[PDB]
């Protein structure tokens, strides 16, 4: 059934599974028209499909042309997400296909279930966790490839860089969700934290900076401070 804190280590067992987050698929700016009405302009979006054990990120870029001439775009976006996830699964060798797909929003359950009827042995599951994957577009190398795309495109990212050389998947996922929770709560502060020291760089082949083990503990502490702090400024405590 639903994924929660009781069954949290199941994410790091050896059954292949993917998270699917659809919150950045349909993105718009809202603006005034010359007549003083309001209109939307779509911008490129992305499906965030993540293996939490390996860090492999299947980033399907959603080009604004897919919305041309379509109605009820927020509803379409869920079905388009499910269509692309289904297409991804079918593209994978049988031994790489997931046993479970966990959707971050319950509104994806029926669209994904219908698209995966062909795969009755793949479990489609909700979660009670409030995962911060919407903040993926706060990662510089991911936002850049999405905004530059001129056509539909899949890029395969590893969102853990080489952390798994030094830490376990459980710890890597915890670091990722802490970084993303911070970027979501106060993007500027979070980004200041991550790039303050100009002697810690992001390699050309890495998304996040090359922190030593010790520096990661400092960084992680600063992010928890930030998230507690903005848990103050927001609520006054």
């Amino acid at each position: 059934g639903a994924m929660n804190s009781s069954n949290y280590a199941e994410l790091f067992n050896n059954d292949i599974k993917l998270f699917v987050d659809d919150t950045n698929v349909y993105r718009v700016t809202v603006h005034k028209t010359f007549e003083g009405n309001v209109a939307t302009k779509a911008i490129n979006g992305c499906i965030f499909t993540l293996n939490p054990k390996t860090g492999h990120l299947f980033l399907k870029i959603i080009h604004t042309s897919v919305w041309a001439g379509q109605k009820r775009l927020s509803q379409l976006a869920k079905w388009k997400t499910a269509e692309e996830v289904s297409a991804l699964v079918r593209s994978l060798p049988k031994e790489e296909q997931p046993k479970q797909i966990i959707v971050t929003r319950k509104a994806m359950l029926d669209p994904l279930e219908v698209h995966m009827l062909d795969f009755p042995n793949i479990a489609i599951r909700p979660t009670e966790l409030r995962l911060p994957f919407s903040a993926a577009m706060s990662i510089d190398k991911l936002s850049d490839v999405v905004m530059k795309a001129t056509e539909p495109q899949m890029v395969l990212f590893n969102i853990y860089d080489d952390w798994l050389d030094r830490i376990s998947s459980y710890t890597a996922f915890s670091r990722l969700t802490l970084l993303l929770r911070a970027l979501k709560t106060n993007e500027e502060s979070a980004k200041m934290i991550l790039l303050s020291d100009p002697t810690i760089t992001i390699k050309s082949y890495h998304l996040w900076p090359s922190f030593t083990d010790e520096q990661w503990i400092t960084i992680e502490s600063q992010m928890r401070d930030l998230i507690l702090t903005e848990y103050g400024r927001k609520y006054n405590v």
Partner: protein, 300 residues
């Protein structure tokens, strides 16, 4: 007019005949039901006084044979049987009509209720849902499960209603996933009407039979089938106009006949609010919406 004779009434029982019902006391001199209208299917049903558990009954059509009821003390129920000796049947029954030991089917002349509940219900189709081919009549009770309930356990004692499943490959065309899930017209018109039922009369017959089994026996799987068949139409954008008009009449008379005190277990709040207020056909069921809003406004 036809007659269903009883050998005797050895145990106290409430007996239903269609929408009517009456109490018979233990060992009371009761020998059956006369003046049954020819031209309609009928159902004769039972609830014992001691054990209200298990409502049970028999669907029959007097044009198909001479049927009588005899209590079986081993199996503990009133059983329907067919009398093949027409002369014996004639000789035995006339005596009970002479001794006035039968209740009269009590139809009011103005009253089209039973016709309106069974308009599309045929015995031949009942006998395919309820498989027991050695009898011309069909037994149903409160506990019998449906073929679809058995897929989610005795297949001989099953109600073989047509399986409807909105998240199934039958219902959903490859490449039309969103279209077919959000608008069920394909599944209704091509898969079900053209493919399985052949025409809307057979669809309505099964829908009406499911409702009647739900109402008379409290058969939960029948209630599920009745609501699924309603929802499949209401969730289709493209439905022949004559079908929508007939469905409104069908549901109107079902809702009119439903006992007021059984509405909480026989009416699915989600299905009715969706069908009446959200679906493609939300504006197409005027008679049904009006009686639902005046009789069961709490559900809505």
């Amino acid at each position: 007019m036809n007659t269903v004779p009883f050998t005797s009434a050895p145990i106290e029982v409430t007996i239903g005949i269609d929408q009517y019902s009456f109490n018979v006391k233990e060992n009371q001199p009761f020998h059956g039901i006369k003046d049954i209208p020819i031209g309609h299917v009928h159902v004769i049903h039972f609830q014992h006084a001691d054990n209200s558990s298990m409502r049970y009954g028999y669907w029959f059509d007097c044009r198909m044979g001479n049927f009588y009821i005899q209590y079986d003390p081993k199996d503990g129920l009133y059983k329907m049987m067919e009398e093949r000796d027409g002369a014996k049947f004639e000789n035995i029954v006339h005596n009970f009509k002479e001794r006035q030991m039968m209740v009269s089917y009590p139809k009011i002349d103005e009253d089209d209720t039973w016709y309106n509940l069974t308009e599309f219900v045929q015995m031949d189709k009942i006998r395919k849902i309820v498989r027991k081919d050695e009898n011309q009549f069909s037994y149903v009770d409160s506990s019998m499960t449906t073929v679809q309930e058995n897929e989610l356990s005795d297949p001989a004692h099953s109600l073989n209603y047509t399986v409807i499943n909105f998240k199934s490959r039958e219902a959903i065309r490859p490449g039309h996933e969103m279209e077919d899930f959000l608008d069920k017209s394909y599944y209704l018109n091509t898969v079900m009407l053209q493919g399985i039922f052949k025409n809307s009369s057979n669809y309505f017959g099964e829908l009406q039979f499911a409702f009647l089994n739900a109402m008379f026996f409290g058969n939960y799987g029948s209630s599920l089938q009745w609501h699924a068949m309603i929802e499949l139409i209401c969730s289709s954008a493209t439905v022949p106009k004559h079908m929508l008009d007939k469905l409104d009449e069908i549901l109107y008379y079902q809702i009119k006949t439903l006992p007021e005190q059984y509405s909480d277990i026989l009416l699915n709040e989600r299905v009715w609010n969706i069908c009446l207020y959200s679906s493609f056909q939300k504006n197409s069921l005027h008679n049904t919406e009006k009686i639902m809003e005046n009789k069961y406004p709490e559900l809505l």
